[PDB]
Symmetry: D2
């Protein structure tokens, strides 16, 4: 009959109106300052552009071994040129109190050194996966963090991704029933002309082939989806001997794991076949399919039963949670500010590395390897 | 047999490496400065966060009627507090030479005044859809732009969206065959408690109901998908008389159009039913389905023939084109810098408004309205 | 620990075992005998092969005007050659008591005559859609059925299709909320070289173009999905004047309807664009998409809300309901045997024909046509 | 302008018309007579109803150990009661010349005996998967067939399924590129109250657990998709020791295979988790997903690349190929009549059984088993 009060009270003249409804995550502050270490592929395509969507984090400094590249990137991102560092003068960030944390986006073998160096500079450390190339180095990093009284977070972006968290939630709410089979597959074609992949062919830098680089998503994913750790592992690997890419590292590897609950998993990683990021969890009541499972964008999950497929993915007009990149960045910031623990700490990063080494041993010996070593996931999956 | 040269030449020591491969759009500059006018729902959720992904644009100033809100937003976005303006002091932006363009994100009826005022201040104008609430006002805005020797762009985000451009491309490449039927549906539930919707219930501010607000996507979309203009239009509208939201404006309206080619279209808009953004184009060789068609995120297109459904949407790891928000922003910047014309100019915005008025007349009279007035789309669809 | 009793009691020697679990509809009898009238496209591809899946029906006789064709078909289907009739000797089926019903699969204009003739022969009549080409003929058929004390069923296969019934169920269970918008589209390319389509180009035989043939699915579907009848109708039609197929009948037609509940619908039919069978129902809580909506096989339904798409279609190993063809056939049989009414009676067939005529009038005059004539759907939708 | 000749020549009077266009497979004859052996779950739900869609086959006789059940089924299917046999009088089918072949749908361990007995009765044999429970028995069956000069076909329904054949075709046309990874998963929850599953828990009757029953789809499928045989196999199995269903047979088993081409595969079968029939083939150009892969109905295939998913499944109005059941039945008939070889012969059935035994050995020993024994697939995959 008549218009509502709020509609009728709007002026036809230019006037100030209130704060609008948020249908997306809005910015708060830029109180946490980061120093980005290693201006490569992941850093420039994903990390550096992910800072804009953060609610509490900011890019404070850059550490790079390419001066011209660093000067360009600093200009692109509004960083002070006086805040550009190199690998030799790296330790001088300890004098800057505006740098709260350090994000190491270097190649695998150089992770430990710079983490440790950052801990000695009194900084918090966000380190990329995989943690280190050895179990001892993972331990060294943890010890150094403890000694410095700083936080160590591993860059497991899937622990902050909405679709992956949705999947975990429904599994935890018993929608699939009793879990018995998990299947993962993660692959992408290795290109040696790409500079980011050049160190990945080198065993001394990478620390392993496809399992270390992308098989780890299927490995870490299996653990968080099941909410448990494997007690036994078995594996096989093969790479074509005439392929020049696989001289030092593995192309394809298949691993099987047994969990205390009775659950089994079979997974694989590949450097020679196209884009695959597919996870499947089988329960007695339903089956969950994640394809794409661990993408940067467009992840989709589906719960299937006979005659039904219930799918979820991000909405078309709203953004109910923030993206995995911005959320990961803000997570360390929030844990530091609020004095809470980190969801992806160094012990979690150490566990994957230890399991990878066990998988590599099982593939090498051809025997099963016991991995029942009592790792307990702090704060849940 | 042996490793490739580039893999073997990588040092095991920390070293500078080259510029990495881009798999996403990287920043270039921030050479084009914008003044954002109207700090509301669209501005705060979509526009302001879309600036980060631009390659040439930057937020230079803010114009708002809410000072406290403006001070908060400026702080969030790094804007100088000295660059915050209000509606009375709006014309003083002419003194600032760092402000290149003005983006008007005000309610429909206030679009013309501020556009004209910005043209008198020597600025380029990006104006939101729908252009104005009258055809004469659209004309006034165009005249003012011409007189100022400035560019006028209407905020049709779908003209810069990758999935929508993909759809146009395949239609143009004859994948559906000879086109004969188009079906569009755009709807969302109108909430009067939301402040952004309060002016939308008012005829004096909005200039029409659902067709003006969301039916325009289906209308503009039909034209770009077909690549032609309608010569005849017919319509019907209904709103429940006891619903307090539809006292001044229309809830539901259905319109049918005829094109010179022989093609027909049937479409509708609704303020009382949930999220629908679905377009369908029927040809004699294939049928194209766009659902979601005009979302902010997650658009998906599908080409169907018997036994087949070929789908496209954005990739999971790469971002081959930029998003619709950032691209729209950068478009005006690029046209100004490179001296090229704008893809969504004022004449295009004027055409939709003229067609909407014709549709409203046809619904009011119950007779068909001839719309064969010789509009030619400059630069294509 | 030990095996269960039933597993342990199975002999290792060849032995008779029980009746197995049905995961599909099993045969019961062949107690209802049908005479198939008109050995054409629908009859030979869909109807005649659909008898095998019936639980109570059988093909008893064939009536055809092509003797050679009839002799071949009878041999294919195991029908007695003595039970083959022609159009002149049609009435002699009254002497056969093994023929319970007659299924008329003739062209539209010949429906009434043969229905009436079958009623005079004391048979039940299953007649194909559309019922007749006139409202009076529909009435004549109904009167004749009443007088004979026989059942009249119209061949609306979608009233016996599992996916279509599933859709109705969820709408009725309030899963979409309050309904406001329905969109239907039914099309297929008309080929004049096909003999089944040759009578469809003739107005005297077909009784109308695309609306009569395939637009009726969208019309009947709208009514059953909404669970109500339209009180007002509006329409437009166009066919290209140089196209030789559309000299007597319509190619494309778009119709809009208003329901007493407030709901609106917009739909269309086409003879010149490819395979489209798409229905969409918009509510305030959710949106239902049926694509394919009225196929012979592979129908799929989807309930969408932001971030979700819940789909249903037939299961991969089980068949919980019978197919639409067999179920339709068995329906008339079951109503006769159990003395219950038919779900798709002649009054329902008469209603569609009356609405089609109203739609044709509205398209011809260009004015809205009131269709509030008090039709009540007996036994529900 | 004017109507076409064929449309204009149609009479308005009842007249005979030609043979219509087939959009589905029509019947030809019933020249091949089958004797169905074992009236159980598969026979009654899939096989017996699949005869109706055959173009050359017919059910001639029934062999069963349950007389009451056999009498009911014969009546349902129109079989002469004089043609009902039991296991003792089985050999008396040699006197009937109307019985051309025998279809053995008995439990696994009883397959060889009845096949051999049918070969001595001068009949062709269609035998169900898995061929036998031993390699020697498979060999005995082959020898017996050779000696009788009769054909032996194994019931691999997926070799006659349209979606599975479509998948093979595109792989063969190089749409995925160079193949490197195959992943299969086949599972369904084992119910001991179902009589069909009671012999499946018994090792003496079944010959193995899940791999023998459903893992074989993933095993046979991998071979036909790759178009090659494995030279090496590795496996692991686990069943919960307190579960009463898995006392004699395996619940879950995971197997990995290596092919001469370099390709790898990882697959699994399960008796304790719900309906899964998912195959994935990874190439360097694209990835193929089959889900459902080996269903009775509704199989769907999808070719994925970044930003694209091209799907295929059966059409909504046409049926371009016959179903897997009817086609399998007609295949043996056609090979006999036309003197061509069978696509799924005994050597193919023997190969799967030999590979299964090798997989069981590898799981038992925990060592890899060489399977490079020179099997050549006759007539292709
Ligand atoms: N979480 C995830 O999703 C992803 C994680 N990553 C992880 O991030 C890390 C970096 O990967 P990515 O971005 O592909 O690598 P890039 O090779 O593209 O970048 C590594 C950068 O580290 C620096 N660098 C320093 N010393 C060396 C050296 N000896 N050899 C090579 N580079 C050196 C260089 O920076 P500069 O030239 O500026 O000195 C180089 O650009 C890895 O640990 C990887 O596993 C990668 C992709 C995704
Ligand atoms: N292209 C697209 O996808 C979309 C376009 N839009 C278009 O953007 C425009 C703004 O929409 P939306 O963001 O929802 O509107 P909001 O109502 O949320 O924002 C409008 C803003 O304009 C200012 N305003 C000035 N005078 C008035 C007045 N008299 N009444 C109301 N507001 C006033 C206020 O800014 P302040 O308080 O700072 O002074 C207010 O916040 C519309 O033209 C709309 O059609 C909207 C959504 C999407
Ligand atoms: N419910 C549904 O899904 C469908 C329903 N139909 C309905 O079924 C009916 C038949 O359609 P369809 O199978 O395509 O038609 P066809 O033209 O293929 O078959 C009609 C048959 O009717 C007989 N016939 C008798 N007199 C005439 C005449 N003067 N002109 C033409 N045919 C004549 C012929 O049989 P004979 O040669 O043996 O004498 C002819 O084969 C129509 O009412 C149609 O609307 C059609 C398709 C689907
Ligand atoms: N290709 C495929 O898709 C499928 C193949 N199968 C294969 O078909 C076969 C039968 O499976 P299924 O239909 O589930 O089995 P069922 O147990 O349902 O049927 C087996 C039948 O064999 C006869 N039988 C004779 N002796 C015995 C005995 N000692 N124990 C049990 N049954 C006996 C019985 O017939 P009666 O009572 O009449 O004497 C019984 O009904 C198996 O080889 C299976 O692997 C099964 C499903 C699918």
């Amino acid at each position: 009959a008549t218009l509502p009060a709020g509609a009728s009270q709007v002026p036809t003249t230019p006037a100030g109106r209130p704060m609008p409804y948020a249908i997306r995550p809005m910015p708060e502050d830029r109180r946490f300052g980061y120093a980005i270490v290693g201006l490569g592929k992941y850093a420039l395509n994903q990390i550096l552009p992910g800072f804009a969507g953060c609610q509490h984090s900011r890019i404070e400094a850059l550490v790079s071994g390419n001066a011209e590249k660093a000067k360009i990137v600093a200009a692109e991102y509004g960083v002070d040129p006086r805040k550009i560092y190199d690998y030799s003068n790296f330790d001088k960030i300890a004098k800057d109190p505006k740098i709260d944390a350090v994000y190491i986006i270097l190649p695998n073998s150089l992770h430990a050194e710079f983490a440790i160096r950052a801990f000695k500079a009194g900084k918090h450390v966000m380190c990329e996966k995989p943690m280190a190339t050895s179990v001892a180095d993972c331990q060294r990093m943890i010890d150094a963090a403890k000694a410095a009284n700083k936080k160590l977070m591993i860059g497991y972006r899937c622990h902050y991704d909405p679709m992956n968290r949705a999947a975990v939630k429904l599994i935890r709410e018993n929608q699939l029933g009793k879990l018995g089979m998990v299947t993962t597959d993660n692959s992408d074609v290795m290109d040696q002309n790409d500079p980011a992949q050049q160190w990945r062919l080198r065993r001394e830098l990478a620390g392993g082939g496809s399992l270390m680089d992308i098989g780890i998503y299927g490995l870490n994913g299996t653990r968080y989806l099941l909410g448990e750790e494997p007690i036994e592992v078995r594996a096989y690997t093969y790479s074509d001997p005439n392929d020049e890419r696989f001289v030092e590292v593995e192309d394809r590897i298949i691993w099987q794991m047994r969990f205390r609950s009775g659950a089994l998993s079979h997974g694989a990683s590949s450097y020679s076949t196209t884009t695959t990021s597919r996870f499947s969890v089988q329960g007695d009541k339903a089956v969950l399919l994640m394809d794409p499972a661990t993408g940067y964008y467009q992840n989709l999950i589906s719960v299937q039963t006979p005659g039904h497929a219930n799918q979820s993915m991000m909405p078309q007009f709203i953004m109910p949670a923030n993206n995995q990149f911005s959320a990961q960045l803000d997570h360390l910031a929030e844990a530091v500010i609020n004095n809470k623990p980190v969801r992806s700490p160094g012990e979690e990063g150490m566990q994957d590395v230890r399991l990878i080494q066990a998988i590599y041993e099982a593939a090498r010996t051809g025997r099963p390897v016991n991995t029942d070593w009592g790792y307990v996931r702090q704060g849940g999956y």
